[PDB]
Design a protein around this ligand. Structure first.
Ligand SMILES: O=c1[nH]cnc2c1ncn2[C@@H]1O[C@H](COP(=O)(O)O)[C@@H](O)[C@H]1O
Ligand SMILES: OC[C@H]1O[C@@H](n2cc(-c3ccccc3)nn2)[C@H](O)[C@@H](O)[C@@H]1O
Length: 807
């Protein structure tokens, strides 16, 4: 083969084949007679990687020569997924490699399936960073992703007896061909110790040292020959009875061992704090070294931007202060000016339990100098507040970085706002919520700081890579330029009454569904009807995301079928997938409920092929790339005001699914772009949630007034979905009835009603597809290229460029 996958030139195909064989022989030390598919994968990976290095070296050389302002994206998570196909796509090598491997008697698709996901993230926040890296490279920005090389990423999810089981994601077991270890650039990171005051300033002494060893991964831009770097730090013990001392090196190296999988509830664990400082301290030394290798820190903000991916790397603020004040001997006010102008903070949630509030005693022991600096920041900040709002004593306590109580805590979000020149939310409604609610006081003090940067996804991974069929039929009409200028998809509006294009869009979808229906049987032995509506909700398991509301609809459909069995209903395959954080009991119960519903629904002979409930095990980037192109209906049903943006929603929109959604996060802007008539909008708006909270949410009211909902709750309570453990779901019912923060019942009626309208439209394939085209055509805004261009211009003060570097 297809046009968008590039040229398969005889010269390149020949050279790829020989370098494949060279790597198989010299690199893997194998002959064709004993080589396994995995060996073939690695030979291909090494072959493709060879094409990156020249561009990688010259990109970084170019930055050294031109000395542009550098963008440092600090994140504890980079949810990269697989790299092989992405690299081929960005290098225009896909058809060539397909041809080369075909001629070697190999199927490239099979080889691609061997690659492990780089699962160095939990979900949306981690994947956003990955999309952002792709866009920054595509937009020719001198950008670096900085993070941690976890030995173990997000756990692999196994489902046993309907329950989530976690297993270590040993993603590095067979090696990682994409990374280059840089042991020569290893940097010390300090912990514990104590602060000593001398005649000339404070000194941080008697510290324990952990070494930070960088591993660099290339980030190729889309066909622009730009290759940027993602630098991930690995923890190493310094080299200085005997046996135990050597074995105790593990303690230091545990810092980079495992990604914390808790994306729901802030856990004030010391190891997590260590990870956060570790990335910050090592990264800032690299930044400063690179800045010096071009005394006068006045130009620092002109040459450096640091983007904080939430508060996780918030220690960058006091760490920069520490370096500037304690080591470079700058005065406080100048260092502060430099820090503020360098740092910018992105918030990704308003959920209070997720916000980082570090106990003072933990910072006191681990980072005594940083605590002192935070206190000083706080005093000076509060003096500003007091001068701006004299006599407003409650404002002072509300805005303080130090939260008083049983345990004193540092509010890291407050630290970030104080120490950043820019604070942004990730969707217009979220950014407004920031200014109206949690950060209202800060907005009132410094309104200029507060911005919106609506999230986006990369159309490379999220269209070209995962849905080549759709990419192709689009390119056939409007050319290939849209891949790096997604707004061009608007040109597809002129094809909404084009019978050929309607047929093509629908054909691509059917092929995707057949392919995914085949994947399910082959890899999991489950049977689904490919003619059914593919109704999918894939995302991390959270109460706010309301997988439970989806469950309620599923049961409603089931009960309605059971009551009127011989009545026609639009057949559905309801697919729900996502991981639960290991300590999130309710989320684990929700997974069990879904499987328990499936166990009943899928084996009812009266239901037949009309309703299927599938829990998609081990949802991750590589699975998203498979299921999203196959989806008809995208479930984006978080309680209004809770999903900061969502990005899964955008992936579904780009890939030809219609959206059933609340007016939450980016759904609002999506409905705005596509038009509300082309979106299945339901449920309370933020204002309606607010009204209900004022009045008090009473779930019993809904239970008493909707008999269909009563029946479901009675089924859940009585053990209909768990015959051998009748009270298995007691917690869920109890939560729903008595302590539901997310008002599942309040949106139930409108949700079910809206779902009926979905089914109605699906009965008319031509009009379904026409609405799909209207979604795809208006999905342009949600390219992360747009997002990054806005960050670049409005926060970082740099101009994006689509111009190629010489090959
Ligand atoms: O001292 C230098 N002389 C020449 N090139 C340098 C020097 N320092 C860094 N570079 C270039 O910058 C790249 C990596 O620099 P880094 O990102 O600061 O680690 C190298 O591949 C070099 O091409
Ligand atoms: O901005 C990218 C995405 O971030 C998601 N998110 C937020 C977090 C998170 C987790 C812990 C603390 C703070 C934030 N993890 N993922 C957040 O839930 C999504 O709404 C958003 O689309």
């Amino acid at each position: 083969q297809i046009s968008v996958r590039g040229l398969a030139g005889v010269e390149n195909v020949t050279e790829l084949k020989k370098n494949f064989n060279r790597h198989l022989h010299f690199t893997l030390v194998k002959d064709r007679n004993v080589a396994t598919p995995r060996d073939y994968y690695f030979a291909l990976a090494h072959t493709v990687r060879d094409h990156l290095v020249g561009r990688w070296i010259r990109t970084q050389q170019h930055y050294y020569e031109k000395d542009p302002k550098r963008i440092y994206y600090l994140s504890l998570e980079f949810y990269m997924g697989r790299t092989l196909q992405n690299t081929m796509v960005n290098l225009a090598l896909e058809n060539a490699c397909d041809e080369a491997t075909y001629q070697l008697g190999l199927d490239m698709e099979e080889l691609e399936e061997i690659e492990e996901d780089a699962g160095l993230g939990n979900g949306g926040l981690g994947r956003l960073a990955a999309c952002f890296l792709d866009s920054m490279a595509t937009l020719g920005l001198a950008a670096y992703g900085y993070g941690i090389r976890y030995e173990f990423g997000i756990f692999n999810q196994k489902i046993c007896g309907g329950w989530q089981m976690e297993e270590a994601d040993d993603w590095l077991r067979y090696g990682n061909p994409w990374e280059k270890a840089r042991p020569e650039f290893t940097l010390p990171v300090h912990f514990y110790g104590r602060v000593e005051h001398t005649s000339q300033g404070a000194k941080w002494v008697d510290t324990q040292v952990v070494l930070a060893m960088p591993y660099d991964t290339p980030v190729p831009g889309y066909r622009n020959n730009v290759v940027n770097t993602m630098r991930l730090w690995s923890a190493k013990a310094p080299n200085d009875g005997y046996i135990q001392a050597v074995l105790d090196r593990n303690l230091a190296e545990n810092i980079s061992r495992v990604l914390y999988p808790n994306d729901n509830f802030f856990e004030g664990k010391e190891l997590r704090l260590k990870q956060e400082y570790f990335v910050v301290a090592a990264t800032l030394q690299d930044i400063i070294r690179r800045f010096k290798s071009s005394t006068n820190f006045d130009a620092f903000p002109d040459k450096v931007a640091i983007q904080l991916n939430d508060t996780h790397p918030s220690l960058a603020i006091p760490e920069l202060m520490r370096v500037l004040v304690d080591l470079e001997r700058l005065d406080w006010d100048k260092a502060w000016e430099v820090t503020v102008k360098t740092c910018a903070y992105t918030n990704h949630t308003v959920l209070p339990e997720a916000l980082e509030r570090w106990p003072v005693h933990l910072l006191e022991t681990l980072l005594p100098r940083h605590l002192q600096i935070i206190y000083e920041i706080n005093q000076r900040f509060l003096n500003r507040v007091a001068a701006a709002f004299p006599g407003d004593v409650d404002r002072l306590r509300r805005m303080s970085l130090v939260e008083e109580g049983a345990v004193k805590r540092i509010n890291m979000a407050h630290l970030c706002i104080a120490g950043s020149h820019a604070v942004n939310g990730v969707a217009r409604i979220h950014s407004e919520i920031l200014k109206k609610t949690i950060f209202k006081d800060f907005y009132e003090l410094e309104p200029h700081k507060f911005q919106n940067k609506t999230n986006g996804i990369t159309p490379r991974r999220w269209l070209v890579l995962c849905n080549p069929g759709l990419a192709e039929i689009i390119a056939e009409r409007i050319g290939e330029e849209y891949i790096s200028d997604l707004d061009q998809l608007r040109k597809l509006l002129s094809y909404v009454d084009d019978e050929a294009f309607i047929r093509d869009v629908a054909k691509v979808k059917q092929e995707n569904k057949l392919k995914f229906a085949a994947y399910l049987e082959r890899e999991y032995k489950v049977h689904i009807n490919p003619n059914s509506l593919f109704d999918v909700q894939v995302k991390r398991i959270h109460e706010y995301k309301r997988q439970l509301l989806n469950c309620l609809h599923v049961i409603t459909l089931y009960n309605r079928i059971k009551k009127e069995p011989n009545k026609f209903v639009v057949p559905r395959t309801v697919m729900i997938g996502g991981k639960a954080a290991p300590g999130y009991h309710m989320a684990k119960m929700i997974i069990k409920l879904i499987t328990a519903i499936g166990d009943v629904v899928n084996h009812d002979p009266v239901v037949g092929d009309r309703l299927r409930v599938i829990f998609l095990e081990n949802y991750r980037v590589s699975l998203a790339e498979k299921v999203i192109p196959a989806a008809d209906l995208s479930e984006q049903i978080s309680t209004a005001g809770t999903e900061a943006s969502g990005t899964g929603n955008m992936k579904f929109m780009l890939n030809g699914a219609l959206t059933i959604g609340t007016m939450d996060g980016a759904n609002v802007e999506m409905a705005e772009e596509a038009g509300e008539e082309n979106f299945f909008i339901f449920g309370m708006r933020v204002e309606d949630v607010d009204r209900l909270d004022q009045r008090g949410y009473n779930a019993q009211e809904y239970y008493d007034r909707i008999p269909e909902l009563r029946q479901i709750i009675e089924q859940l309570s009585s053990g209909f979905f768990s015959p051998k453990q009748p009270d298995l779901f007691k917690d869920i019912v109890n939560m729903l009835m008595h302590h539901d923060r997310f008002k599942v019942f309040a949106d139930y009626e409108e949700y079910v009603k809206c779902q009926e309208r979905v089914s109605a439209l699906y009965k008319n394939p031509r009009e379904w597809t026409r609405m799909v085209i209207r979604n795809i055509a208006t999905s342009g805004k949600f390219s992360s290229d747009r997002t990054i261009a806005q960050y670049a211009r409005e926060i970082w003060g740099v101009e994006p460029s689509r111009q190629r570097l010489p090959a």
